Amino acid sequence: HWGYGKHNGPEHWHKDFPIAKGERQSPVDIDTHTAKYDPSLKPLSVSYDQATSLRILNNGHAFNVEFDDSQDKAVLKGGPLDGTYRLIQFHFHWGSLDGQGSEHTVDKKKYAAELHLVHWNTKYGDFGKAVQQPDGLAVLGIFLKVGSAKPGLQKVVDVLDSIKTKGKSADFTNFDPRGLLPESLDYWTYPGSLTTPPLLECVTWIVLKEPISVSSEQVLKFRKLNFNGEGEPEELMVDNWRPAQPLKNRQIKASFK
Numbered sequence: 001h002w003g004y005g006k007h008n009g010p011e012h013w014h015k016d017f018p019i020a021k022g023e024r025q026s027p028v029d030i031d032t033h034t035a036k037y038d039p040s041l042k043p044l045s046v047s048y049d050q051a052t053s054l055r056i057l058n059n060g061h062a063f064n065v066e067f068d069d070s071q072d073k074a075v076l077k078g079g080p081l082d083g084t085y086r087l088i089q090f091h092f093h094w095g096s097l098d099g100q101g102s103e104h105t106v107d108k109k110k111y112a113a114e115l116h117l118v119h120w121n122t123k124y125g126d127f128g129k130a131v132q133q134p135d136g137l138a139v140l141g142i143f144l145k146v147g148s149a150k151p152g153l154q155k156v157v158d159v160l161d162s163i164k165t166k167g168k169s170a171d172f173t174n175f176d177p178r179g180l181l182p183e184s185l186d187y188w189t190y191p192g193s194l195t196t197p198p199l200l201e202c203v204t205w206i207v208l209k210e211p212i213s214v215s216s217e218q219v220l221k222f223r224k225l226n227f228n229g230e231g232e233p234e235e236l237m238v239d240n241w242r243p244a245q246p247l248k249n250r251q252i253k254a255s256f257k
């Protein structure tokens, strides 16, 4: 029953998920003047050439592009991370309007949407065990702004008709998530949480400084999705973002000067 309406939205989640008011919740505002350059952070290593996408699913709160994570085919390493993190899925959060939609903000600026590439620490064996560990997940966050189209997103846009409603899935093989990356891998990093229930505090967040641009037609297609199931009253899947949470006792580090 959690969701993003007036009656079950982010301000309600604490009643089922008390960790909502915890010590390391996400997203946060990234105050660019207070994040500290940390010259000891390494370059991020994104190794996606062997990625195997399988399926795309509307789960009633976003859509997930899911990957085969039973071997080291698409991994994230380096940066703030120790060890190897396997890509399991990516999804997006977006707005009803171009002026909102991202979860992280940068000096209080909201982007039109935010992509999360979700990875789990292979020393924990599987995703379900990894979410129980403080260093269990690494999520790569990438901001979307509206402008020129992103060619490598179009295959995702074009399948959304087939997963309009909650519970719908479609084969989605041979999708290359390298086509969703910006040029620069400059990033901010901080310890945080899943941004949907169960809000577990298991995520090293790596948020890229450079946004990707997508076309107005691309984001319009996200906004045609439905939160509801087929044969239920239509509620457009829009504004599926949690707002910024208190930073509390955390420092955001920057990979760049």
Ligand SMILES: NS(=O)(=O)c1ccc(SCCc2ccccc2)cc1
Pocket (backbone or CB within 6 Å): 116, 118, 128, 131, 139, 193, 194, 195, 196, 197, 198
């Ligand atoms: N928006 S986010 O990137 O922070 C994010 C990533 C992954 C999940 S998965 C649901 C949590 C879960 C699923 C299955 C077993 C245990 C926990 C939720 C939110």
Ligand SMILES: [Zn+2]
Pocket (backbone or CB within 6 Å): 091, 092, 093, 116, 195
């Ligand atoms: Zn997310």
